[PDB]
Design a protein around this nucleic acid. Structure first.
Lengths: 71, 426, 71, 426
DNA sequence: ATTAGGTGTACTTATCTACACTTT
DNA sequence: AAAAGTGTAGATAAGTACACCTAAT
């Protein structure tokens, strides 16, 4: 598993794992997140999607993402 | 002033103002940083209003004549919340113990219970009912269901004393075939794959009782301890008085029928935001609603749904107190929480469900899917549940037959109009 | 100041601030990130965009985003 | 074995194996966690190869006969890297000091310098003839532009000793009108809004010199200290030997003309990935290339471009050693880094730039923008720079006139064909 | 016989390459 | 004599939903 900086794919993977962690059907989770399951499949596989979708699913599943001299 | 102890750890202080008659709650900085609040309405920063604290504490108390038992042991007034919570403080709903400063009974013992001692209470000495009669009129929730919270090691039952606490809840039946009802319903829930508390039928003398495993409590074999996990009901989550447990909090009178200030399905689903996983929560809640609809539970209300409290957020608890009310016609058959402003289960059709889902801002097909899944699986499921039963008499058998018939009837009835739902115009 | 939980807007703002932090014109940064400045404007304003775009600009400007009982 | 000191802190150890003739670098865990490596080719885990360490250390040394001067004071062989770094360890390029264990001499004081001491060095040796080496040189490694890195408080110059280090680089001119060239070029850079080191002309006796402010060194007024910030050139960044500073590392011979193992623009831009902000870096590099093209700097090479090293990533340094070679026809006029396999500045046209940007995978319009912006800004800029000059004689004036003319000529020439770039077919 | 998937229209939308606009 | 941040327009390309059907276990 990656604590590393996220990319388009690892985000989809994260979503997928968080979904499977809740033992949720794709259709059910997608419907509840307000998207078709096909879109959720696209998101999980890291395929290109609207940022809005990603944030819908992310906010849906309660996933929080955050932004990470002289000598 | 009382100290708040969670397990062996003190998470803060509950202070009571005698003169002002006001409550205050303040937390340790350690807990402020690493911990979680009693409820959403009593934050760690100590901004909790006296009202919310009071209502929260009241929600922990018994809602039945059993309360009047607490008045029998206690020497205080009905209007006194503090003394009552102080009395039952050591063991109550949730993992929180309210301890006077510098007072601990760590070293205490166990008090084993022989069946005669249990049977002794069924005679209703030092115990409800007295006063065995419901209702004024049409019940419910009181006082016909006598219960005892006890420690259960898998063999013998015992009273919890001191730091120890009851790991199980034993529910004794007076009214006809209630244990069998709740047993079949709960097992039916579990068989369907739902998240539900574990139940087993236990026998005391000639009397049958329902032993329920507390999910907020875990016993450790090999040592003496009882592990608690903090939880809150939906009333405590929404910051509602115990009176608001029902969507209609002023009673079933057709004059006040239009006034609903209490817990509704919208108000319930609104709590999904505070959950660690809102989707899963809404799924659980929806399946809870549909399940209660199919099993004909009209008593499913605010305090029958609770959440685990954690630093990361709330989590829904396993279902509990699942009973088919449709079986008993001496009770109130209108739903505690209406479906789109409809409290009559018999008046539920594609429209009510369609508008119900539309009212939640969720797709209807979710309900169609969730509903069709269960109702179709119940016929084979209910069969497996009946075989989990102990020996019965003819009345009980007839009751179970009636239960099966009614359940199947509801299943068919709902399964009848599900297709119409998609095309409904609200 | 930096708000921890990210939304569609605060991400665009974050991008905009990191861009202006490097004292880069929109056209140049957009061009180097492989997008038209109009798209970069859409992103900065938090308006809906392809996730790929967001990641192009994010990866371009060196912005890293990461996933954040009993008793 | 030498200890690595950054400021007042020891960041690790550089170990040298005499028998194996191999170098090793190992770091303190504190520095491993919170710090940054000497270069990308010498990681904190201590996996840095002897080769990369060697090349890195060699890259710190003088590339001219000055090397033989350090050999004159040290008295060791050319093939000895350790002794040289051991000798100059206290002051070198970057913030790193190489200190033998438990040994510090200085009890640091100041050694003020009077002009006579400088003229004595401007006078014969004090060896800096340096021609004719060997060999009839051409490219700006040729001959001598004698310089000394010294401490400058804004008033008086002094020699840096011990922990103290030179905050400025004083460059003396022998070859005709070099100080004015570098001054005008650097000031022209600064005027255009580019990131460039600050330069001021200083006078010693009748001799003119160019005082350059080191960006890797910062002096604190009100106290005696010199703060260092670590940096690395592109050779040290790409892990290339000093010989690879020029894209053609085997010389300008028409036999080796096709062989380029050295630093190119692609290899340079490849480093943008390691920067904290790749876009800004690529921007800086692009503007660097275009600026050098417009100002006619053919000596811009690997060691003339450097990066600040930080734990978060590399950052580009201000530009330095910017000079117009087109003025001097006794030097090598072919670019150190070619534009799409074209080393002749006079042969650069829309095609070369188009393919150059295409080779970087960047839009042409970017180059069109960056080029068009500067080329039009130079005419008004160069005027402002001339006013920054001290009093001149007729020779210098003629030189500046020639410089201005050549500059404007280049600007127009490039501005001539810039538009064609978009429509080019590579 | 259920979940994770690929189809299919019809629909809505982002992206790109220029030009031209409102303010420094 | 702009510069940087905006929008506009046709044209290309691509996401979304909605429901039907597939392949396995």
């Amino acid at each position: 598993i990656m604590a590393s900086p996220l990319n388009q794919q690892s985000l989809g993977l994260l979503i997928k794992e968080r979904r499977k962690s809740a033992a949720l059907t794709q259709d059910v989770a997608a419907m509840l997140c307000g998207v078709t399951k096909k879109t959720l499949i696209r998101v999980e596989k890291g395929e290109d999607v609207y940022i809005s979708t990603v944030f819908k699913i992310l906010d849906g599943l309660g996933i929080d993402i955050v932004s990470a001299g002289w000598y | 002033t009382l100290e708040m102890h969670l397990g062996d750890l003190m998470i803060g202080e509950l202070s009571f103002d005698a003169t002002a008659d006001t409550f205050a709650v303040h937390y340790t900085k350690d807990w402020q940083q690493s911990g979680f609040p009693l409820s959403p309405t009593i934050p760690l920063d100590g901004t909790g209003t006296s009202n919310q604290i009071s209502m929260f504490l009241v929600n922990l108390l018994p809602e039945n004549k059993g309360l009047d038992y607490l008045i029998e042991s206690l020497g205080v007034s009905k209007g006194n919340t503090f003394a009552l919570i102080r009395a039952i403080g050591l063991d109550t709903a949730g993992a929180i113990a309210f301890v006077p400063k510098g007072a601990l009974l760590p070293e205490t013992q166990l008090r084993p219970i022989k069946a005669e001692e249990v049977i002794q209470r069924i005679e209703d000495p030092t115990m409800w009912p007295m006063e065995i009669w419901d209702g004024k009129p049409r019940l419910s929730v009181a006082g016909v269901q006598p219960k005892l919270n006890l420690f259960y090691n898998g063999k013998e039952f015992a009273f919890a004393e001191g730091t120890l606490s009851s790991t199980h809840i034993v529910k004794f039946e007076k009214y006809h075939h209630l244990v069998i009802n709740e047993f079949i319903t709960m097992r039916l829930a579990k068989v369907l794959g739902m998240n539900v508390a574990n139940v087993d039928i236990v026998h005391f003398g000639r009397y049958k009782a329902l032993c329920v495993e507390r999910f907020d409590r875990r016993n450790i074999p090999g040592e003496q301890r009882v592990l608690r996990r903090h939880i809150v009901d939906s009333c405590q989550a929404l910051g509602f008085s115990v009176s608001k447990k029902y969507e209609r909090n002023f009673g079933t009178g057709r004059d006040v029928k239009d006034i609903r200030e209490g817990v509704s399905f919208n108000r319930l689903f609104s709590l999904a935001a505070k959950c660690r996983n809102p989707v899963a929560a809404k799924q659980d809640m929806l399946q809870w609603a549909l399940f209660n609809l199919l099993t004909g539970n009209a008593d499913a209300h605010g305090k029958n749904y609770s959440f685990f409290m954690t630093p990361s957020g709330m989590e829904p608890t396993p279902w509990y107190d699942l009973v088919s009310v449709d079986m008993y016609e001496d009770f109130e058959q209108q739903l505690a929480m209406a479906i789109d402003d409809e409290f009559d289960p018999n008046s539920i059709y594609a429209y009510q469900l369609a508008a119900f889902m539309d009212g939640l801002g969720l797709p209807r097909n979710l309900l169609i899917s969730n509903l069709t899944r269960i109702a179709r699986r119940i016929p084979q499921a209910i069969a497996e549940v009946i075989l989990m039963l102990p020996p019965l008499d003819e009345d009980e058998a007839s009751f179970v037959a009636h239960y099966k018939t009614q359940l199947l009837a509801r299943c068919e009835r709902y399964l009848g109009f599900v297709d119409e739902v998609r095309d409904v115009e609200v």
